[PDB]
Structures are given as structure tokens and as C-alpha cells.
Amino acid sequence: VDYIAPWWVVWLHSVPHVGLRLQPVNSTFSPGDESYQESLLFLGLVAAVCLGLNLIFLVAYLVCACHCCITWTAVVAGLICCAAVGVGFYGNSETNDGAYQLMYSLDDANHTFSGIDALVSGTTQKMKVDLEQHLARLSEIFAARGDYLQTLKFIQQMAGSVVVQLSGLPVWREVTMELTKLSDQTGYVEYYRWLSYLLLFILDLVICLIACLGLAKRSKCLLASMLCCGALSLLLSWASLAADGSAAVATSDFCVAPDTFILNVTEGQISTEVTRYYLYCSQSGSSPFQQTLTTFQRALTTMQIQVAGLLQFAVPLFSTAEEDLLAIQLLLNSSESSLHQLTAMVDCRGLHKDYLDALAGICYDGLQGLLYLGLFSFLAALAFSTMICAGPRAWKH
Template identity: 80%
Template sequence: MRVTRSAAVGVGFYGNRETNDGVHQLIYSLDNANHTFSGIDELVSGNTQKMKVDLEQHLARLSEIFATRGEYTQTLKLMQQMSGNIIVQLSGLPVWREVTMQLTELSEQTGYVEHYRWLSYLLLFVLDLVICLVTCLALAKRSKCLLALMLCCGMVTLLLSWASLAADTAAAVGTSDFCMAPDTFILNTTQGQISTEVIRYYLHCSQSTSSPFQQALTTFQRSLTTMQIQVMGLLQFSVPLFPTAEKDLLGIQLLLNASETSLHQLMAMLDCRGLHKDYLDAVTGICFDGIEGLLFLGLFSLLAALAFSTLICAGPQAWKHFVTRDRDYDDIDDNDPFNPQARRIAAHNPSQGQLHSFCSYSSGLGSQSSLQPHSQTISNAPVSEYMNQAMLFGGNPRYENVPLIGRGSPPPTYSPSMRATYMSVTDEHQMHYEFPS
């Protein structure tokens, strides 16, 4: 059972590590995708704000300055038209705000569930080890109360193991269904929020697949290039005639340069390679490390359930063995110095443990009050007389603590040192328990 428990704990820790790695990889991929989508929305909203507000303010002031020059006014109208084109192209890009909120919520829920799942399995591992060690201690100490307590704890842990096995199996089955067709699941989930063409572009990301943002980004870049050329022409020809227009023209030039930088960042973020890599990492974390960890956790739960079932079945047998061993000492005299229970009692009661006689006081007192031993020290009576006396008082020759009738010496089977001890104890009893006639 200890081998099974150790194997179960090892499998459980390995599965827990695999599940943690898969979930952490999923959370990392979700955070990266969330950061990318948030960056796209910020760039789109920032460029739209620049074109609608900042550029319009500069163009309005320049229109007042160039009111007397029709060719400059036509240039400003062309720039206003280009900024309108940029706004239209930016508004055609998908808005990832709802997707970002869903990814943020999914990442937080996944981290929350994973934290408590890891903590619960860790506590279950510790509980299994504690019950195993305390059960071994109860068997070594032959403690019935401790064994009964561990049997109750084992029953509770058995139920927890079966519940864990059911949860792991359900999670593994659900995850396997997702891993059979993850693209279809994501398409169905994002339906109505993002166009199918955009989702397929990120899911497959092949060289043959054209980017759905290519036209919008190309128009954005051409419009910026046209506006920059017009601003450079105005700076070259209109500033000598209208010096007050230089400040606004330089402001427009800085704005267009910042928009061009944002355009390059937007093109990099909208490229499918980064998001597709995050998607593959998330699917790998779920469908490989995640499912493998769930299977190992299920195996751990199964082994733990079998181990605790064995413990609960073997507990009553150990209990019966305790009772049988206790009954083996019921027919032995408590004052017998060779009785293990008497040794344990003597260890707790030193006053009684220091008696070193080979016969009990009760039997000695009763025999000496009625029968006085002879004065001879050593008797050479045949062995048959000793056996007859032993059979008379106990029916079993091993009751050697029964006093011998008509004899003052120990049986001939004792050694000389034991005879001397027996005679000294007999004399001491006669001195203390002598009654007047």
C-alpha cells in the first residue's frame, strides 16, 4: 500500500506540474493577444483623433492665412480629402474592444481557477501522505483509537479521490472535444463580433492567404505620402509669402510623421504571424500539456482511491489481530515475571516491578499458614512426585509458582543460583508471615 501511495503521489505531482505548465502557457498567450488587440485599438483611435481634431485645426488656420491664394487653398482641400480617406480606412478596421474584454475575463477566470485547483490538489497530496504516515504509526504502536481515526479520515479521502477523478475525467473529455476542432469553436464563439475572413486569416496564417487589411493599410500609407509631399511644397513656396503659416505647416508635418510611425506599428500588430503563434501556443498548452496533466491527475486519483480502499479493507483485519493478540495474555498470571504484560505493568509501577521471587505472595501466604515447610534445605525427591504435585494444583506442569506440598526446596529443574534465591525468599516469608499457634 505504501508503494501504491508513493506512486500515486509521484504521478499526482507530475500531472499537477504538467497542468500548471499548460495553463500558464494559455494565460501567457491570452495576455499577449490581449496586449496586441489593445495596442491596435489604441493606434486606430489615436490616429483617428489626430486626423479629425489636430489636423483639422491646422487646416482651418491655414485656410484663413491662404484665403487670397487659390492654389494654396486647393492644396489644403486635397490634404483634407486625404485625411478623410485615412479616417474611412481606419474606421473599416475591426474593433477588438469586445474581444479584449472577453480575453481579459477569460485570463482572470483561468488564473483564479488554476490557483485554487493547484492549492486543492496540493492539500490532497499532503493529506494522503499524513494519513499514510499516521496509519503506519498506528500499526507500529498498535493503537486502536489512532487506527479508527485514520480509517475515518481514509473514508473521507476516498470520497475526495473519487470526486477528483470525476472532475478530472470531465475536464479531460471537454478539453478533448475542444481540441478536436478548435478553429470551429473559435469561429462560432466570435461570430457576430469579428468577420469570418479576419478570424480565418489569424487561425491559418498561410502565405497563400491575403491579408484583409492590406487595402486599408495601403490607402492609409498613400494618403500620408501625398499629404507629406503637399506640406513640403507649401513649406517651400508659401512660407516666404506667408511667414505666419510656417508654424501650422510644421505642426502638420510632425503630425504626419507620427502617423507614419503609428502606421508601421499598426501593420506589425495586424500581421497574422504574431497572433497565430500565440494561438498555437495556447492550443498546445491546452491540448498537449493540459490534457496530459489531467490524465496524470486522473491516474493519481484512481491510485489514491485504490490505496485508500485497500486501507479501509485491511483496517478491520488489523483490528481483529489486535484483539487476538490481547486475548493471548488473558490466561497468564499477572504476577508471572515472564509475562510480557507483567513487564509492561512493572515498567509503569516500579514498586511492583522490583519483586524478584519465583512464587506469588498470595499462594505463599496461603500455603505457609496451613503447611509449614521442612527444615531440610535440599530434597532429593523423585521427579514423579513433583509432577504429581504440579498436576494436582494446576493440571499443567508450567504452573511452577504453586508451592510444593511437603517440600521446602524448589523443583530439581532449577539451577543452584535459583535454589538459593528461592530459599532466601522462603525464609523471608516465614519471618514476616509467622502467626502464633
């Protein structure tokens, strides 16, 4: 699998991004910059401007019709309104799917990083503390037996080497905290936004159906409140299109060059080799962790050889301390299982799949949901404008 920018990201990214003074600004994604923010609020204000122009058109046409076919166009307005609600339902569902995909990928990355950190801490503590305590006990009992104390010092030195080469690994405490904060913020914003958009769709369908109800038969006095609610939802739909366009432009500017942005965000918290390793899997290249894991496994094999030999060549001479020599071997083989797990978690594929899934989620699903919500806003604005400007229609006398 590989990541390439699909056509819609390229099309949206090429949309001009200028400030309030129309000055061209670097289009690279950088939310911290004030200039980029002002660039996106420029498109927001452009959307507000076209909203104002559309309202001016409605008021002018309404006053012209009042001072100075039709029912088919009203029915058509209702139909396009319903189609807009449907398209918006699909787009909101897709955007929610993208947001949940991003949250799931972030949670998977959090779990895999916390597993690495937990294994690092557990192995370091286990080896250093418990191995030193046991080794002190063996040196206590193996006293006055030279070669045995020399081998004990050897395994102590190998333990020190393991501790050094294992601490020489990234510690993702702050990375875990950042991932957790991002996941919680995404959850809050996404849930509230989905509630808001579901409420908007419900109100849109409700007002469309009940406005057509008045036109159909029975009472006709509803149309005044129907017009008021239609105008409110029309301005709300214009604001929705503004927000959706701004968010889509920002997400596309992120998605065109996501690897560079991620690599230049995690600059001090994370090493450069590790990030370049996870973002671009080095199937042809060499894993940066390979040397540390190799030293770890070589040291563990040497420990196992020495301890097994000690078990086999110390029963007759001492007949004691074998009750904790079995314990030190059990500790070593548990650490071997820990090493297998650790080299299974630090692999490029594990985090790279999560990152690629998050990228596909955000870009594909989220931004297609975004332009589909923008299209919903456009059709809703069109149908709302037509149904508001349908005219007094004799006030149904």
C-alpha cells in the same frame, strides 16, 4: 509551426458521449447545448457508479474477513499511495503550467488587441480633429492664394479617406472585454483549484505516513482514525477522478476541432475573414487588412509630399504659418510611426503565435495533467482500497 491533434486527443475524443438515456449526441464541442452537458454528466455518473461498486466491494470483503502476504501488501499499499502522491504532484504542476500558459497567451492577445484599438482611436482623433484645426488655421492665413487652398482641400480630402479606411477596421472592444473576463475567470478557478489539489495531496501524504506510523511501532490506537480519514480521502479521490475525466473529455472534444469551434463562436462579434486569417495564417494568401493599410500608407505618402513641397515653396510668399506647418509635418511623421506600429500589430503571425501557444498549452499540458491526475486518482483509489481492506489485523493486541 502547425497544429495537429496528438494521439491522446484522438483517443479521448473517440470515447463515447451519450446522454442519460444513452442516446448518441453530436460530439462537437458546444457547452451551451444541454445535451452535451448531460453527455458529460453521464460519464460523471458512470464514475460515481464505479465508485459505489468499489465501496460495495470493500464493505463485502471487510465483513467477509471479519466474520470468517498481508503485511507486505500493506507496505505495498503505502508505497503505491506515496507514488500516487508523486504522480499527482507532477500532474497538478503540469495542469497549472497549462492554465498559466493559456492565461499568458490570452493576456498577450489582449495587449495586442488593445494596442490596435488604441492606435486606431489615437490616429483617427489626431488626424481628423487636429489636422482639421491646423488646416483651418492654414486656410485662414493662406487666404486669397488659390493653389494653396486647393492643396489644403486636397490634404483635407486625403484625411477623410484615411479616416474612412481606418475606421473600416475591426474594433476589439467587446473582444478585449471577453478576453479579460476569460483571463480573470481562469485565474480565479485555477488558483482555487490548485489550492484544493495541493491540500488534497498534503492530506494524502499525511494520512499515508501517519497510518504507516501506527503500523510501524509505538501506539496502535491511531488506526481507527486512520481508517476514517482513508475512507474520506478514498471517496474524495473517486470524485476527483470523476471530475478529471469529465474535464479531460470536454477539453479533448474541444482540442480535436478547436479552429471550427472558435470560428463558429466568434460569428457576429468578429468578422469571418479576420478570424480565418488569424487561425490559419495566409502565408500564401493575402492579408484582409492589406487594402486598408495600403490606402493608409498611400494617403500618408501623398500628404508628406504635399506638405514638404508646401514647406519648401511657401517660405518666401508668406514667411508665416511655417511655425504650424512644421507642426503638421511632425503630426504626419508621428502618424507614420503609428502606421508602422499598426501594420506590425495586425500581422497574422503576432496573434497566430499567441493562439497556437494557447492551443498547445491547453491541449498538451492541460489535458496531460488531467489524465495524469486521473491516473493519480486511480492509484490512490487502489492503494486506499487495499489499506482500508487490509483488515482488523488482530487490532494489534
